[model samples]
Target: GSSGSSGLPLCDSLIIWLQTFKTASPCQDVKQLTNGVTMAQVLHQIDVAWFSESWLSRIKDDVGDNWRIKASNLKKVLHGITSYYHEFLGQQISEELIPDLNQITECADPVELGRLLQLILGCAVNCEKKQEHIKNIMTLEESVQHVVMTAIQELMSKSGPSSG
Candidate 1:
């Protein structure tokens, strides 16, 4: 599959890059809890290379829909491709604890949001080992919750004025 009305097959493009690299490429892994260079690693680099510099500037002001989409997309990619990624994260922070974007967005700052997201992105992929220590601090979940919550608030504010 190549292109269609939207231009390309998102499902297919995901695979294409994965086929070229081969990480969990899903319910995936973190450290040794791990092997080859891995598709998750490759995909991550691709994301960093492709959007590292541009993502911030483009979304810095709006920082609403874009932030959630980025987080949601990264979560989807990691959850699907990396092995044991969430298992480690799961041990630290339960999914039930993941706060809604609307709840904390207004209070979360841009720099903090970007910093934590970058850290999480780099941390979630590894050779599949027991980084049981992450559970110790639980910083990841708390950081993400605040940022997404603030982002949701921005979205609501923007849409509120236009919709009515």
Candidate 2:
């Protein structure tokens, strides 16, 4: 009922979830999420085609606690992810969902970073459903048929003979 303690579970759940999709390093806390690498890893896991090195290579893993570096990373990730969602999923992310990139880049608040993490998780969930729907259509659209042929022959062996 309270956002105070409730936020802890959300943060903890996100950290656990991210650890599953980690690239090289595990996310120990929400602070690790600020670097944006973890989000890229999650996105890549969801869709390797769009979130491959094409956009993922742009994200630096070791920013070393710089606001500019963190902000730049966040921008690259957000740009790639948001564009994919908008173009394919037809979902629009409004300002209310997240703050301005400029503002988050300046300070990089933990709370705001948590919000971003949640959004990424949401993307994974929605993409899972979308992928399943596409898979269903693909299997039906690309259906194929196979025919099997069987031949029976009789042969005489010097030692013995077998028949079916």
Each prediction's total of clashing residue pairs, residues at least 3 apart in sequence or on different chains, is 29, 0
Please list the residue runs of candidate 1 whose C-alpha ends up more than 4 Å from where it truly belongs after superposition: 1-43, 46-84, 88-90, 94-108, 111-164
- RMSD of model 1 against the true structure: 18.7
Candidate 1 Cα deviation (angstroms), residue 109: 2.3
- Top candidate on TM-score is 2
**TM-score of each candidate?**
0.22, 0.64
Estimate the overall C-alpha local distance difference test score of candidate 2.
0.54
- Name the regions of candidate 2 deviating beyond 4 angstroms: 1-9, 99-105, 128-164
Which has the greatest lDDT? 2
TM-score of 1: 0.22
User: Tens-digit lDDT track for model 2 on 15-88?
Assistant: 54555565754666655677777777777777777788777778886776566777787887777666665665
Residues 1-164, model 1: lDDT tens digits:
33322211221122222233333322122111011123234434444533243332232222233444333333333343222233423222223223222322433322322322322323323323213322322333454334433432332232212122
